[PDB]
Each structure stands twice: as C-alpha cells, then as structure tokens.
Design a protein around this ligand. Structure first.
Ligand SMILES: [Cl-]
Ligand SMILES: [Cl-]
Ligand SMILES: [Cl-]
Length: 221
C-alpha cells in the first residue's frame, strides 16, 4: 500500500460543510463518501444533499437531526434509486418533509461495502484502493472540540462507544519514517473554522484510536 494518501489532492473531496445544530453528521459522512465515488466514476465533483438524507431515510432506520448511520444512508440511496444535489435540495439543519425529486438525482449506489471491524489495516487498504471512507468515531471530548494542530490523541477516547460520523480522506505520517508518527486525515462537518480548516489528524496504528476502524463503510457505485 502507499506510504500516504490524500484524496483531496486528486479532486475527490468537496469543501468543508457545517451541520450546525442538527445531529446529522452521519449524513455528511455519507454524502462525502458518495461524492468521492461519483467522482471516481464520472470525473465530476458534485456536492450532494444531506437534507435529502435527513428528510427521507427514516424508513431505513435513520432519525434525521436526532442521529443516524452511514450504512443506512447508503441503503436508502440504493432502495430509492437516487440522491439529489446539494444545490437542488439545500441544507437547513432541521427535520423537514421529504422532497426527493428523481429528476434532480446526481448519484446512485447498489449497496455498500463494510470494512472489517476494528481493523486499521483493513481501513488503510480501503482508503488506498477506493477513495474517501465513511467512519464512525468517538468525538465527545472538549479536546476534540478545540482541536487545532498535531496528531490528535485523547486518553478518554473509546474505540467502542461512538457518537459521530466523519470521512477519512487519506492517511500520512510525520517526519521521514513512514512507519511511525502515523495519522488518519479526517474531514469533519463542523465548518472550515473548526479544527485545521475543518480537518483533523487522528492517531493511526494506536489501537484503533477513537474507533476510526470500528464501523467503516463505503457506497458501491
Ligand atoms: Cl454506519
Ligand atoms: Cl499538524
Ligand atoms: Cl489543509
């Protein structure tokens, strides 16, 4: 596998978004993964609608602004036959009536692939071969809220009890040795002002830190 990967440098990733006061990170994680796969398939980067997922995927088990899961979102896109663009179905950060319009669909998936649970090496293979990967993590810490620089490492982090969905866009390392001081490149949905331009480096190969490889998945397009 490559010593480092950064799908942002290849055009696969949209600018950082902001979920605001709605518990929809699962939807931003899912649109980010679908944006990358649609780019890999067509060469066009098109921002996708989180609101479409918030409003319409209750049957699949999502709860809108009260939480959800990325795999359930990919399930909805498969069952639904499509997903609207951000532009045609704008984000308003509250639960609303489903307004899915097939004529505005710009994405599709046939299901999704699961990374083996807990395997950082398996997550590394998927990031390297596929593109950006949806992942769950434990983000419930002030140290995460005020993250700014460096490789994030929080002793209080759980690898099992997770509460946030994010997007792994690559991986890398500090210094000249590719085998140490490793990190995951993670896209958040708290706006560009949060973190490092909306991104965070999470410690890699430090026993599945914050659960990054516990529940990872990507859409099949
Ligand atoms: Cl999931
Ligand atoms: Cl840094
Ligand atoms: Cl940056």
């Amino acid at each position: 596998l490559p010593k480092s990967v950064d799908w942002r440098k290849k055009g696969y990733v949209t600018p950082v978004k902001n979920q605001k006061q709605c518990g929809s990170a699962w939807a931003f994680s899912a649109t980010g993964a679908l944006e990358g796969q649609m780019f890999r398939k067509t060469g066009k980067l098109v921002s996708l609608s989180e609101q479409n997922l918030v409003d319409c995927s209750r049957p699949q088990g999502n709860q809108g602004c009260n939480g959800g899961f990325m795999a359930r979102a990919f399930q909805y896109v498969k069952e639904n036959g499509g997903l609207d663009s951000e532009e045609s179905y704008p984000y308003v950060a509250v639960d609303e009536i489903c307004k899915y319009r097939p004529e505005n669909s710009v994405a599709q998936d046939t299901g999704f692939t699961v990374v083996a649970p807990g395997k950082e090496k398996a997550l590394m293979k998927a990031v390297a071969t596929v593109g950006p990967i949806s992942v769950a993590m434990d983000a419930g810490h002030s140290s995460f809220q005020f993250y700014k620089s460096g490789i994030y490492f929080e002793p209080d982090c759980s690898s099992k009890n997770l509460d946030h969905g994010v997007l792994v866009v690559g991986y890398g390392f500090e210094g000249a040795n590719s085998q140490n001081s490793k990190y995951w490149l993670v896209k958040n949905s708290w706006g560009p002002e949060w973190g490092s331009n909306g991104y965070v480096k999470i410690a890699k190969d430090k026993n599945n830190h914050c659960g990054i490889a516990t529940a990872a998945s990507y859409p099949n397009v």
